[PDB]
Design a protein around this motif. Sequence first.
Motif, PDB file in Angstrom:
ATOM      1  N   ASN A 125     -39.968  46.894  29.219  1.00 55.21           N
ATOM      2  CA  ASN A 125     -40.985  47.007  30.285  1.00 55.21           C
ATOM      3  C   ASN A 125     -40.330  46.811  31.668  1.00 55.21           C
ATOM      4  O   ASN A 125     -40.859  47.333  32.668  1.00 55.21           O
ATOM      5  N   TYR A 183     -41.836  47.914  35.636  1.00 57.77           N
ATOM      6  CA  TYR A 183     -42.562  46.966  36.465  1.00 57.77           C
ATOM      7  C   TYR A 183     -41.526  46.337  37.435  1.00 57.77           C
ATOM      8  O   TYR A 183     -41.893  45.859  38.493  1.00 57.77           O
ATOM      9  N   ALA A 205     -42.947  39.907  29.919  1.00 56.40           N
ATOM     10  CA  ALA A 205     -44.045  40.851  30.068  1.00 56.40           C
ATOM     11  C   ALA A 205     -44.126  41.812  28.864  1.00 56.40           C
ATOM     12  O   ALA A 205     -44.616  42.942  29.008  1.00 56.40           O
ATOM     13  N   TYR A 251     -50.688  44.122  34.357  1.00 56.66           N
ATOM     14  CA  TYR A 251     -50.098  43.537  33.181  1.00 56.66           C
ATOM     15  C   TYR A 251     -51.112  43.245  32.056  1.00 56.66           C
ATOM     16  O   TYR A 251     -50.583  43.121  30.923  1.00 56.66           O
ATOM     17  N   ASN A 257     -52.958  47.767  32.302  1.00 54.42           N
ATOM     18  CA  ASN A 257     -51.637  48.425  32.012  1.00 54.42           C
ATOM     19  C   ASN A 257     -51.920  49.887  31.751  1.00 54.42           C
ATOM     20  O   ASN A 257     -51.019  50.748  31.849  1.00 54.42           O
ATOM     21  N   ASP A 270     -48.975  44.575  41.393  1.00 57.35           N
ATOM     22  CA  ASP A 270     -50.225  44.381  40.646  1.00 57.35           C
ATOM     23  C   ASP A 270     -51.433  44.602  41.554  1.00 57.35           C
ATOM     24  O   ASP A 270     -52.258  43.731  41.919  1.00 57.35           O
TER      25      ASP A 270
END
Lengths: 407, 412
Positions: free
Chosen positions: A313, A317, A379, B308, B312, B349
Amino acid sequence: EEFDCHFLDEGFTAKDILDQKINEVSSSDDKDAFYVADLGDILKKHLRWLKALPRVTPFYAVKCNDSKAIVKTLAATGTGFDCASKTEIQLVQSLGVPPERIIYANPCKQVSQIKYAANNGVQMMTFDSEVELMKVARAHPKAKLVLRIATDDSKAVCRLSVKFGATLRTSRLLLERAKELNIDVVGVSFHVGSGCTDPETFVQAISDARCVFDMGAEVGFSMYLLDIGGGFPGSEDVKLKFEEITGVINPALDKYFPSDSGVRIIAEPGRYYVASAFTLAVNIIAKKIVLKEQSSEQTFMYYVNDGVYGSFNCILYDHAHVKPLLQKRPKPDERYYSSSIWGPTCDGLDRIVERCDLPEMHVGDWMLFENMGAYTVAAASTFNGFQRPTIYYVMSGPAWQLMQQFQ
Amino acid sequence: EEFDCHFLDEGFTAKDILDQKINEVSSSDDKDAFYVADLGDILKKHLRWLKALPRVTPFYAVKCNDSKAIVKTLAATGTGFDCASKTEIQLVQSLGVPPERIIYANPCKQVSQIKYAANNGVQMMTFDSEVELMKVARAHPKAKLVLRIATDDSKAVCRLSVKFGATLRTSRLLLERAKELNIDVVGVSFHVGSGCTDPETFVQAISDARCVFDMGAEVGFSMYLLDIGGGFPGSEDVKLKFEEITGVINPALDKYFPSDSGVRIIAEPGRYYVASAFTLAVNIIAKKIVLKEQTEQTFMYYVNDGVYGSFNCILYDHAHVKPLLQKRPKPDERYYSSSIWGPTCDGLDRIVERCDLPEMHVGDWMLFENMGAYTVAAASTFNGFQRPTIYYVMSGPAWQLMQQFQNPDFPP
């Protein structure tokens, strides 16, 4: 206490224990991915932080890697913890650590979570808005509060108004408003981030927060706490290195934040402590030969047993760039081919490495990814049923020596 | 049960339970995010499937949403199950489904998990490569294999390799090679996927599948199993609706694969069954105001679930989510340009870059419908933030339909 933690035998490194675990399973299918995590690597990082930044107290950013073995290696070492939610406060609370070594450095916090911290002894928190002061008033009136200012040095893609960080102007306002409220504000925090091309963004950050302390002063506020945030590099595989950044931090702090002024200086390092300590081993489970261009080789597709829903991941991210490594010992001097590397899931976009050059590999060979400790296992999920790699924690006799002084 | 399932009272519905539950909470909050999940909406979807695609037996793609209540509901209702890993086979077999209502439809399987399958009676698997056939020849030589073929459809982006699917030329080599390992190939599968713009892609894939069936026959397979994959839309809010897809598919199945030819036709729907069933409610937890514009007019709202956890889906599944007010409007109330953010410490986010909303307040609720597919299943607890608790509801009439299916039900 309940984690494996295997002292290395006398000649052995963390790299050797990798080779041992792969040799154990040489004949016997169960070739699941695994990590080797060197708690000796982490105790070296802390020693190096003491020399490089003698005035700055390290508050470990828990979100980076919350494994219980890591927090407790660090809690025995003297670090504080930066915690962003009730379950990170609770984690560090259960590992024996006091109130006084936590900062709750989430600027925008749910009100039940504010209320939890105040009930459990946790007083220092961050903020950057009026509603937030408004909330604390109501739920943690005796809290000690750090105002978070904007920095720069990049944001990923144009978009308009950033997540956290006040203007000087809004800080002018926020200092006044808190004055209206009888709320004690004690300091300034910023966060430059790990996409720093240029160390003078720290100096700029430090200079911008003289301003804001001096704006603390005119309203009546007596402030001491300087928090310079995170974003320091966690391996040597980066172009701007830890001590290049810290050369520029130190006489910045000297010019703007003299010790005889009374200041206390903290920071919130995350990937600095844990990124290089973790090495990931994954197995090659599936393989395609592409007879390519429109026992017979030209380009290759390799499928491995961890992907972009799991440990990788990080490439989505956190913008990671990962590098496949062999620990087959190189042959005489072997041909390389253009290749790609895919995750285990049934998802067409679970793809780890779109193109790289590798020797021809076979089903059952092992690939290694070093520098995989930060924003990786934190995560990951178990989407499609694929489980998390088991982590093996190790320590030399010489790092235990190092540990064994302070606790 | 063990999980949280309640029956509805008569003229009371899932949207009704939602409204209530935010209206029991109003003081001493802890106002955590939550789902309402309507298991009766799964029974609706199944009856509509059997009407729209009467020749096609559906095998639920477990990876879309693996909540045990959703899987137990589908098992009693009679579906098969598409499983991709050892832990998905285990989940379904722990509910009592037999191995014959499983297809292990992952073309690239770890050897140990292939051996688990063979030790547990799961015979039907997919493949698309010669190394896969090698692996099967060693660890599960009596498997019944299904050859996964490449599909078309046009894109997001244009890149060096596609992960799955043999071409026609590859397929002919694979069949000769199976035949030389004495491995049984029994049929063909393909997956178009949920971004088909054009239902004609199903018509082309079905025609390709008939070309591999005939290649089969030439080297001595008797193929009977056609698997048309997944991709069907899970809600009415899409340009290309379900019954429009099914109305091109149906005549192409009759053309290329007539009932008198022996064939058995399945599919692998994942989001079709579950997308509309879940509605998620999140609490505004924080708010910031941005005035007159330089490089009160605008607001920035922080909620307690994010990219998250449940959202997602906007990263991995390309989802577009549509914030719904529940606090029941005010006639013509004045709206503002508006951004919505998750709870994590992370400056990426963010959930919605710009909506137009009416000024809102900490402690208010915002609602997200159609959140059942590729959401909870891929969520993590990064930064310590916890998954929203799910509440299952079902009507008395949906429970009895489920019983009229409830599905021992068949063999000889």
